[PDB]
Amino acid sequence: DLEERVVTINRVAKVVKGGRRFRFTALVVVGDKNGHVGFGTGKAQEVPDAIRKAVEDAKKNMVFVPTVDTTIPHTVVGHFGGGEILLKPASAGSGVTAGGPVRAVLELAGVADVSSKSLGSNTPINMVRATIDGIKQLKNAEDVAKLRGKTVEELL
RNA sequence: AAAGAGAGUUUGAUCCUGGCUCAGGACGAACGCUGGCGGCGUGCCUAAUACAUGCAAGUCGAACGAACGGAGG
Ligand SMILES: [Mg+2]
Ligand SMILES: [Mg+2]
Ligand SMILES: [Mg+2]
Ligand SMILES: [Mg+2]
Ligand SMILES: [Mg+2]
Ligand SMILES: [Mg+2]
Structure with a gap:
């Protein structure tokens, strides 16, 4: 649905x-x-x-959204327009800490443990665009391992 | 293992920059309304201003000076 x-x-x-x-x-x-x-x-x-x-x-x-172990794999920063959103992983059971639009987008995405900070303007549309842009450059261990021609155990 | 929440306000409406204000925590605190108890703590932050009254540093007869029972008269 x-x-x-x-x-x-x-x-x-x-x-x-x-x-x-x-x-x-x-x-x-x-x-x-x-x-x-x-x-x-x-x-x-x-x-x-x-x-x-x-x-x-x-x-x-x-x-x-890559959501390995119900948590962002690594910290990222969005840069769309005049807005800035920094997302970083959080421990299990830490909940979600974010601003309004960022809380909404993260909750609808499905993640449960992530902490974010707004470092730019507070216009809601630019905040959402910055959050999505930051989500763009997320990574998975399997994908980068395939990119570099090695296994996950060798990489991690 | 740790790992950061924002909101209002310039405009006929926008997007930036920028200041102002608020949402939290802590006092050797003070004031207002009110007030049942127990445990553990704290109490001149100002005038290092002026001080009644009492007590806070004395002790050794094993180095040289007591009343009584009581020798004797
Ligand atoms: Mg469009
Ligand atoms: Mg306000
Ligand atoms: Mg009182
Ligand atoms: Mg009363
Ligand atoms: Mg009590
Ligand atoms: Mg004093």
Whole structure:
């Protein structure tokens, strides 16, 4: 299946000679606890329509998270735009410590032991983009062992 | 083995930079409302300002000076 959570909704405007027109832009993070997660944005005159459009957008750009032993294999840093998110492994039973959007994306991804810090701006969309970007350069022991032509025991 | 949570605020709406404020912990603490008990601790942070009253450094007859029972008269 696919579970979704709403992050934020913002009312944006645009000026015309007859006044102004407003509409809502909604950010939605979808994912399942198997290790798949994604984010999306929607825009509509009504909030539920924006949520539905954001969900449909998020369903099209899913990614995967390596979650060996329910923990990030190694620390990484995202760098998208003006946001910075640092993710590092945590011990078993430590829970998840993160900011709002980062907590949402990590919880929907499926990880249970990870600690993160925000080192940049606090704009939610840039925070989510930075978190996903940091998730990009994750690694698995088997994959790097195959890349370097050796076994896991030799590498670890 | 250890390993870090953010929020509000400049705009008609944005994205950055930047300051201000708040969410936590600790006192030899003080003030306000209130107040049942037990154990263990702490109590002039200011005037090293001025001091009633009492006690805190004396002891050795094995180196040289006591009343009584009591020799004797
Ligand atoms: Mg797009
Ligand atoms: Mg505040
Ligand atoms: Mg009191
Ligand atoms: Mg009282
Ligand atoms: Mg008591
Ligand atoms: Mg003193």
